[PDB]
Amino acid sequence: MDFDAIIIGAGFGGLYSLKKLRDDFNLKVRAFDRATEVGGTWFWNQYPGALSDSETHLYCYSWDKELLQEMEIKRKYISQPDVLAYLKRVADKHDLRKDIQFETGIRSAYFDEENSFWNVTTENDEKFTARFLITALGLLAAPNLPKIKGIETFKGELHHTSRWPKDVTFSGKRVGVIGTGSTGVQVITAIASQVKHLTVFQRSAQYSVPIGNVVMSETDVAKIKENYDQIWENVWNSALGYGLNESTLPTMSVSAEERDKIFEKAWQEGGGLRFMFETFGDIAVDETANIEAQNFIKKKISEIVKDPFVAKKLTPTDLYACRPLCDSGYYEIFNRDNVSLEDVKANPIVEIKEDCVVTADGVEHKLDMLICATGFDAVDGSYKRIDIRGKDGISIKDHWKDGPNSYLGMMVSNFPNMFMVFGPNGPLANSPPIIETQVRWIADLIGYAEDHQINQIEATKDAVDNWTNTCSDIANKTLFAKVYLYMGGLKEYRNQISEVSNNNYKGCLLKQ
Ligand SMILES: Cc1cc2nc3c(=O)[nH]c(=O)nc-3n(C[C@H](O)[C@H](O)[C@H](O)COP(=O)(O)OP(=O)(O)OC[C@H]3O[C@@H](n4cnc5c(N)ncnc54)[C@H](O)[C@@H]3O)c2cc1C
Numbered sequence: 001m002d003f004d005a006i007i008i009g010a011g012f013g014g015l016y017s018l019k020k021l022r023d024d025f026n027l028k029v030r031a032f033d034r035a036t037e038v039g040g041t042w043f044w045n046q047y048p049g050a051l052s053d054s055e056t057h058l059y060c061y062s063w064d065k066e067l068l069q070e071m072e073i074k075r076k077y078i079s080q081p082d083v084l085a086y087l088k089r090v091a092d093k094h095d096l097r098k099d100i101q102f103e104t105g106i107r108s109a110y111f112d113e114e115n116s117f118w119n120v121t122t123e124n125d126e127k128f129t130a131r132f133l134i135t136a137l138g139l140l141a142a143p144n145l146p147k148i149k150g151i152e153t154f155k156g157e158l159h160h161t162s163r164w165p166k167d168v169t170f171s172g173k174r175v176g177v178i179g180t181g182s183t184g185v186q187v188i189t190a191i192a193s194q195v196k197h198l199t200v201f202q203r204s205a206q207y208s209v210p211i212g213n214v215v216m217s218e219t220d221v222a223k224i225k226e227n228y229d230q231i232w233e234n235v236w237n238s239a240l241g242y243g244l245n246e247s248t249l250p251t252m253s254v255s256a257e258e259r260d261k262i263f264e265k266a267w268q269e270g271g272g273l274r275f276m277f278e279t280f281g282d283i284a285v286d287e288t289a290n291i292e293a294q295n296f297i298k299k300k301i302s303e304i305v306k307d308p309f310v311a312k313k314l315t316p317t318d319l320y321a322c323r324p325l326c327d328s329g330y331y332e333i334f335n336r337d338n339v340s341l342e343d344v345k346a347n348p349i350v351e352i353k354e355d356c357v358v359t360a361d362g363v364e365h366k367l368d369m370l371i372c373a374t375g376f377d378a379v380d381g382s383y384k385r386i387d388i389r390g391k392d393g394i395s396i397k398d399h400w401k402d403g404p405n406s407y408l409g410m411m412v413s414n415f416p417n418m419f420m421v422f423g424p425n426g427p428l429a430n431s432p433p434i435i436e437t438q439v440r441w442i443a444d445l446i447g448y449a450e451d452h453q454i455n456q457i458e459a460t461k462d463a464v465d466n467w468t469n470t471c472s473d474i475a476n477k478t479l480f481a482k483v484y485l486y487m488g489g490l491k492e493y494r495n496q497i498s499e500v501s502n503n504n505y506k507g508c509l510l511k512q
C-alpha cells in the first residue's frame with residue numbers, strides 16, 4: 001500500500017522515528033525489523049556481561065519527561081535485559097507495535113524517480129510504496145567469524161557473541177575466547193569465575209579502565225530525577241553527551257603529582273571517556289599527553305596483574321592510543337589459577353580441530369566451548385547488505401565503494417527521500433542523544449515538505465563533499481587520524497545542522 005514514510009529498524013532509532021513521524025506529525029508510517037520484538041542490537045546481543053558504556057540515566061530517551069521520572073535506575077550502568085525491557089515499555093506506552101511489522105527483512109528499496117516515492121520489497125516478495133525511507137539499521141552484521149583453518153570441524157560449543165544462545169552453562173568446561181575488544185573484555189570478566197579453565201586468545205592488547213558499576217541508592221536516583229531537566233541540557237551543551245565535566249586543561253600544564261591525582265580520581269570514579277576527556281583536554285590531540293595517559297594505565301596493569309610476564313602480555317605496544325575499554329574486573333581475572341593468556345600475535349592460531357585450538361607452536365588448547373568475540377564488519381555493512389537503488393538505478397553498494405559519504409550523516413547522493421538515523425559520517429557521542437537529534441531534524445525537514453507541497457529532497461555532491469571536508473578538517477587535528485565520523489562533538493554537530501535548517505536547507509535539492 002501507500003505510506004508517508006517507511007522505517008527500517010525497531011531499535012532506538014526506529015522506535016523514535018516511528019513515534020515522531022506518526023504521533024507528532026500525523027503521518028501514515030510503517031516500520032520493519034527482522035526481529036520478533038523491539039530492541040535492535042539490544043534484542044540480538046545477549047552475550048554474558050553485555051553492558052552500556054554510558055551511564056543508566058543517560059542511555060535512554062529524553063523526549064518523554066513522564067518516562068524519565070518513571071525510569072528504573074537500578075545500577076550506574078544498565079545491562080542488556082534492562083535496556084530491552086526499557087525499550088519494550090517505550091513501545092507499550094506509546095502504542096508503537098501496531099505500526100511495526102516484525103519478522104520481516106527488507107530485501108530491496110528502489111526510488112521511483114517518476115512519482116517520487118520509494119519501492120520497498122521485503123524478503124517475502126511483499127511490496128510497499130512510501131514517500132520517504134527512514135533507515136535506522138545501526139552497527140551490525142554478525143559475521144566477523146575468524147578465518148581459521150578447520151573452524152568448521154570443531155565439535156564443541158561454538159558461539160559468536162552476536163548470536164549468543166540461551167541456556168549456556170559454563171561449569172566444568174574448558175572455554176576459549178578469541179578477541180579482547182569491548183565485547184571480549186565483558187565476556188571474559190563475566191565467565192572467568194564460572195568455567196573450569198579459560199584461555200584468552202589475544203591478538204592485540206588494549207587499554208581498559210574500571211567502569212565502577214555500582215547499585216544506585218534511592219537518594220542517588222532522586223538526585224538525578226529531581227535535576228533531570230538540567231542533566232539533559234548539559235548533554236545538548238556537551239561534545240560527548242556522557243554527562244562528563246569535559247576538561248580543557250592540558251595534560252602537561254600540571255606537575256607529575258597533580259597529573260597523577262587527576263588520573264587517579266577518574267580511575268576511581270570509572271568510565272573510559274571520563275579517564276580521557278574529564279581528566280584533561282588534549283589527550284586525543286597532543287602526543288606527549290597521550291603517552292602520559294598510557295603510562296598511568298600501564299602502571300595500573302603492572303600493579304593489578306601480579307605476574308610481571310602476564311602483565312607484560314596485557315600491556316599494549318602501540319605508540320598512541322584512542323578510547324579505552326571499560327571493565328568490571330578484567331585485569332584481576334588474569335591472577336586466577338584457571339586463566340591462561342595467549343599472545344596469538346607472537347603465537348598465532350593456525351588450525352582448529354574437533355576438540356582444540358592449535359597455535360603455531362603446535363600446542364593443542366583443548367576446549368569444550370569456543371567464544372568468538374571477533375567483532376563485525378564496518379558501518380556501511382548494514383547499508384550495502386540491502387539492495388538500495390536511487391537515481392538512475394545506482395546502488396548504495398556502488399556509490400559507497402570508496403568508503404561511505406553523506407551530508408550531515410543523514411543524506412546521500414543516493415537518498416532522494418531517504419534519511420539515515422545513526423548512519424555513517426555522524427558524530428562521535430552518546431548514541432541516544434545523537435538519535436534524538438537526527439530524528440527531530442529529519443521530521444522537521446519532512447514537515448517542511450508537507451506544508452510546501454514538496455516531494456523530493458536531495459543532496460548535492462558539493463554538499464556531501466563539503467561535509468567530507470568538514471569532518472576531514474577536524475579529524476586530522478587529532479591523534480585519532482593515524483572520514484567515517486564527524487569528531488566535532490554533539491553540540492557543534494547540532495549547530496552544523498541548525499545552520500542548514502535555518503538557511504532553508506542549503507545543499508538540499510527541493511522539487512515541488
Ligand atoms: C552490548 C552493547 C552496548 C552498547 N552500549 C552503548 C552505550 O553505552 N552508549 C552508546 O552510545 N552506544 C552503545 N552501543 C551502541 C548501540 O548500537 C547504540 O547505542 C544503539 O543501540 C543504536 O540504536 P539503533 O536503532 O540506531 O541500531 P540498532 O539497535 O542496532 O537497531 C537496528 C535494527 O534495524 C534492524 N534491521 C536492519 N536491517 C534490516 C533489514 N534489511 N530489514 C529489516 N530489518 C532490519 C535490525 O534487525 C536491528 O533490529 C552498544 C552496543 C552494544 C552491542
Ligand SMILES: NC(=O)c1ccc[n+]([C@@H]2O[C@H](COP(=O)([O-])OP(=O)(O)OC[C@H]3O[C@@H](n4cnc5c(N)ncnc54)[C@H](OP(=O)(O)O)[C@@H]3O)[C@@H](O)[C@H]2O)c1
Nearest residue numbers: 053146147178179180181182183184203204325373374375
Ligand atoms: N568503544 C567501546 O567502549 C564499545 C563498547 C561497546 C560496543 N562497541 C562497538 O562494538 C563494536 C564491536 O566490538 P567488539 O568488541 O565485539 O569487536 P572489536 O572491537 O572489533 O574487536 C574484536 C577483537 O577480536 C580480535 N580478532 C578479530 N579477528 C581475529 C582473528 N581472526 N584472530 C584473532 N583475533 C581476532 C580483534 O583483535 P585485533 O584488535 O588485533 O583485530 C579484536 O581484539 C566495536 O567496533 C565498537 O565500536 C564499542
